[PDB]
Amino acid sequence: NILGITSKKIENFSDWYTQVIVKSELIEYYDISGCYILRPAAYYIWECVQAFFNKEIKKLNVENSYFPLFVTKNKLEKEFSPEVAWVTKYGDSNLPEEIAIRPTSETIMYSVFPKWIRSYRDLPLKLNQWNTVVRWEFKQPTPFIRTREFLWQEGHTAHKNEEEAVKLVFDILDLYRRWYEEYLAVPIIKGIKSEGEKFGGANFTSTAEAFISENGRAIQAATSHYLGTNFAKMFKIEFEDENEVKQYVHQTSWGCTTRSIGIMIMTHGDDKGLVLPPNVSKYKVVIVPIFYKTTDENAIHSYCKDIEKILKNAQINCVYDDRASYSPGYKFNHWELRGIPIRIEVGPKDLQNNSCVIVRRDNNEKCNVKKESVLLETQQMLVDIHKNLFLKAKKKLDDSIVQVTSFSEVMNALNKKKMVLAPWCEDIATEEEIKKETQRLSLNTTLSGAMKPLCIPLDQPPMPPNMKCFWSGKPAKRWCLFGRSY
Numbered sequence: 001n002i003l004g005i006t007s008k009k010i011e012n013f014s015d016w017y018t019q020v021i022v023k024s025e026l027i028e029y030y031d032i033s034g035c036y037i038l039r040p041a042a043y044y045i046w047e048c049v050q051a052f053f054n055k056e057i058k059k060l061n062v063e064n065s066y067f068p069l070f071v072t073k074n075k076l077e078k079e080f081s082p083e084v085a086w087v088t089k090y091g092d093s094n095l096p097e098e099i100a101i102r103p104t105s106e107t108i109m110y111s112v113f114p115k116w117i118r119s120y121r122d123l124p125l126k127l128n129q130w131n132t133v134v135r136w137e138f139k140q141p142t143p144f145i146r147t148r149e150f151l152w153q154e155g156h157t158a159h160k161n162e163e164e165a166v167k168l169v170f171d172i173l174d175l176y177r178r179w180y181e182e183y184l185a186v187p188i189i190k191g192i193k194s195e196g197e198k199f200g201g202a203n204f205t206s207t208a209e210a211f212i213s214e215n216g217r218a219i220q221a222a223t224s225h226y227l228g229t230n231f232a233k234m235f236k237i238e239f240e241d242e243n244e245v246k247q248y249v250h251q252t253s254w255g256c257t258t259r260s261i262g263i264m265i266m267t268h269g270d271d272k273g274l275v276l277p278p279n280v281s282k283y284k285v286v287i288v289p290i291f292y293k294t295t296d297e298n299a300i301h302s303y304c305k306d307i308e309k310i311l312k313n314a315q316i317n318c319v320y321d322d323r324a325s326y327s328p329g330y331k332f333n334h335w336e337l338r339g340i341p342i343r344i345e346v347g348p349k350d351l352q353n354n355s356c357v358i359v360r361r362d363n364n365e366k367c368n369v370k371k372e373s374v375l376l377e378t379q380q381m382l383v384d385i386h387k388n389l390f391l392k393a394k395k396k397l398d399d400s401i402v403q404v405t406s407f408s409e410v411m412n413a414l415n416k417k418k419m420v421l422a423p424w425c426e427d428i429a430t431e432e433e434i435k436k437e438t439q440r441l442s443l444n445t446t447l448s449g450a451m452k453p454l455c456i457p458l459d460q461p462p463m464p465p466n467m468k469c470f471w472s473g474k475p476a477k478r479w480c481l482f483g484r485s486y
């Protein structure tokens, strides 16, 4: 109890989250606000999704690279500026010229793209970086989700035409769907950003949106931009095509950050602490011995180590918690807090029956398994835990959307912690109006009450013939998701 989570996820979400990330050993706080330390359990998740995404972009011929952390005023100006951090001094001496820390690397990378792209033969150019970027905002930070320094990948491609670039945009977007679904067990909604919310310089921005139903907040999970020729004009990225005509390249860029870990935690975490999809947990299983005063401990030890060797030989990493000075109940909580997917309990009653208790972290179901069946039952249960984590999250996402036709229905849905799907004319002017009015009518958290346009979903319902925009009364164009957000 006292060593566990003492705030309930539904009652005090913010304090629940802080306790989970600290007591599971994911995060350590730091003496610069908005900067957090990723402890091994957190960084292990990053490495897992890194290995997945690398394998998939390699099939698209994207290659990894590394560009400088810094950019000059000259390059940075061809295109954020209040959130760009500036280096001005080395030791006690001022720099000959101030240099900026990257908030994103378009201007750094595209500064040299013209030397590499001269002819249609040089296309497509497909690059990725795994790096950190810095956005020195003064909004309230949130570990993983909203931080001043964060780890990401950013991919950048250049193509001979629009069709090829746009196809890659949406190929990447589906890889993000898979990153979230297959490794983090998180469902997302694909869509297009509104004009007020798209990336600066983008022709259009596609997005994967997630939703945290316990506090009613959407979170942008990943992004994939069609840049058209906009950046090519700014940086003079021209190539000579097959007809000897100078053309601009069509560009994309796309990223996904350690925010994804925060979305995973907020999605699956419960009042016992962290819950990890097996694919991003170092230990799939912890084995906890129960001695119940037998005094024949070497029989228990010998049995638990047998189970450990059966799992490790099958390449299932695990831990046998044989620490003498702690009770089994202490150990149960210890590893539940840290999110281990499966606990195997071995006491004397179990030894006599040649079995063991296998306990799932997601729903705490326990079942007795014969020793010889442990490997197979473990393998299947790890698969089933992931399936259950995803399906439960998918149902909560489905349930968080209310379809509306008028503004009068909107504030009711927001106060029930919902997103709204609404018919919208998509006029950029209306975005600030909707934000203002929904914030005004909010009367409760420390995050904003404003509702904003999340995305125009790729999967559109029919737009009835005379449906009007829920806000302006003009004819509606498409259905758009709106909600409060991180």
Ligand SMILES: O=C(NC1Cc2ccccc2C1)c1nccnc1NC(=O)N1CCC(CNC(=O)[C@@H]2CCCN2)CC1
Pocket: 034, 135, 136, 137, 138, 139, 140, 141, 142, 144, 145, 146, 147, 148, 149, 150, 193, 197, 198, 199, 200, 205, 220, 221, 222, 223, 255, 256, 257, 258, 259
């Ligand atoms: O944004 C983060 N921190 C900043 C700095 C800071 C400090 C304190 C409080 C708040 C904030 C916000 C952040 N922090 C940690 C992990 N991830 C993060 N971001 C992330 O995941 N993003 C989604 C992928 C991209 C999204 N695309 C776009 O935004 C474009 C432009 C409009 C819509 N389309 C990049 C942004």
Ligand code: PRO
Pocket: 104, 105, 106, 153, 154, 155, 199, 223, 225, 253, 254, 255
């Ligand atoms: O920051 C962004 O949203 C885009 C995609 C990654 C690189 N720049």
